[PDB]
Design a binder for this molecule. Sequence first.
Ligand SMILES: Cc1cc2nc3c(=O)[nH]c(=O)nc-3n(C[C@H](O)[C@H](O)[C@H](O)COP(=O)(O)O)c2cc1C
Ligand SMILES: Cc1cc([C@@H](C)NC(=O)c2[nH]cc(C3(c4ccc(C(F)(F)F)nc4)CC3)c2C)n[nH]1
Ligand SMILES: O=C(O)c1cc(=O)[nH]c(=O)[nH]1
Length: 384
Amino acid sequence: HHHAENESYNPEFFLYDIFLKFCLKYIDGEICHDLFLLLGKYNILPYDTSNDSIYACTNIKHLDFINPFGVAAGFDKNGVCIDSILKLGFSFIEIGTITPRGQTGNAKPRIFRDVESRSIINSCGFNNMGCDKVTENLILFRKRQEEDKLLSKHIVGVSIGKNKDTVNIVDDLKYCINKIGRYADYIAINVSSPNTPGLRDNQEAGKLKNIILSVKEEIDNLEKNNIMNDEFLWFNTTKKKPLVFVKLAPDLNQEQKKEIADVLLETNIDGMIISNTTTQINDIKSFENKKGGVSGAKLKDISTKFICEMYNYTNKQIPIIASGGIFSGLDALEKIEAGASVCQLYSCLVFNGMKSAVQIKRELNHLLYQRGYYNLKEAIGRKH
Ligand SMILES: Cc1cc2nc3c(=O)[nH]c(=O)nc-3n(C[C@H](O)[C@H](O)[C@H](O)COP(=O)(O)O)c2cc1C
Ligand SMILES: Cc1cc([C@@H](C)NC(=O)c2[nH]cc(C3(c4ccc(C(F)(F)F)nc4)CC3)c2C)n[nH]1
Ligand SMILES: O=C(O)c1cc(=O)[nH]c(=O)[nH]1
C-alpha cells in the first residue's frame, strides 16, 4: 500500500493500514478512538493534498460542499478534532451530538467492532462535554478558519439532543441553539439515537412537528435579536443562519415514515439525515450479547431503501443527507441515485482509516466517468 503509486503525511502512506489492522485486532475500540483524537489534537494526522473535482461538488440549499463526503455525528462529539478530520479530505463534519450539560454517557464497555462484517454496535449514550464547552471548541475552530484560507469553504454542522434526565426535549434543543447556533452552518436535530430512553418517541408526527417549529423559531429569534450587534451574527462558513436538518432512525414502519414526511413538507425542514443506527440486526454472532445501535455494512441496504422511501414520500422536495454503510464509491453512488445529495461516513473511517476520504473520492469520480454523468448533481435521484 505504497502511496507513491497513486511521505508520512500522505493518508495512503503504507504504515497506516498496518497500524490499523493491528489496532482492530488487539486494541479496545474506545482506546483506538482516543488515540485518533490525540493525533488530531496535535495536528499530526496525515492530510489530503488534492484539489477536489469540481464535477463532484454538491449543495443543499446555499451549503456548497466542495466534495460529497463528510464525517457523521458521534465521531468528534466535542469538536476537538475538526481541522484534522476535515484535512483528511472531507468537505464537512457534524460535531456532537451535544447536550446542554455534559454527560459521561452509559457505562463501559459500550462500543464493539466486528471487522469481518465491517459493523459496529454502540450504546454510548451522548457522551459529551456539554454545549457550553463544545461551543468554546467550535469558536476556536472558527477563529482558525478565519485565518486559514484552506478551510474557508469547509462546513461544520452541529447535532443537538437532550440530556438523559431532561423531561421536555425542546428546552434542551433551544438551549443549544441559543449558545452554539451562531457558529453552526446547520443544526441536526437528533430524535433517533437508540441509547437515550424515550428519545425516538419524538419521531411521532405531532411531537416532531412541534420540535421542528420550535427549533426554527429559536433560530429565527437568535437572528431578530442580534443582527444589529456590532459583531457579525453568523460566525460560520455560510455567513447565514443555520439550516435545520432532522436525523431519523431506520426502525420505523411505513405509516410512521409517511406521517413524518408530511410533517417535513409542512414545516419546511431543510434536509433529512437518513439514517441513524438500527436495532433490528440479529445475525452478527459477536454482537449477540450486546446492547445498542448497529452501524456499518449491515446497515447499507436498510438505509438505502429508507432513502428511496422518504425521497418519494416527500415528493423529492426535501434534500437528503445519506448515512449508513457507505464504504466505496459504488456505495456512495447508490445513495445519491437513491435520492441523497451528500454522504456521511463513520464506519468507513473506522475500518479504512486515514485513506478513507482520498480513496472513496477517487472511486466516485471514476464511477461518474464510467457511468457517463457530467457531474454528481445529475445523478441525484436518478434511480427514480
Ligand atoms: C460510537 C458511535 C457513536 C455515534 N454517535 C452519534 C451521535 O452522537 N449522534 C448521531 O446523530 N449519530 C451518532 N452515531 C451514528 C453515526 O453518525 C452514523 O449515523 C451511523 O454510524 C451509520 O453510518 P455508518 O454505517 O457509516 O457508520 C454514532 C455511531 C457510533 C458507531
Ligand atoms: C465514539 C467512539 C467511536 C469508537 C470506535 C468505533 N472508534 C475506532 O475504533 C476508531 N476511531 C478511529 C480509528 C482509526 C485509527 C485509530 C488509531 C490509529 C493508530 F494510529 F493508533 F494506529 N489508526 C487509525 C481508523 C482511523 C479507529 C479504528 N469508540 N468511541
Ligand atoms: O451517543 C450515542 O450513544 C448515539 C447517538 C446516536 O444518535 N446514534 C448512536 O448510534 N449512538
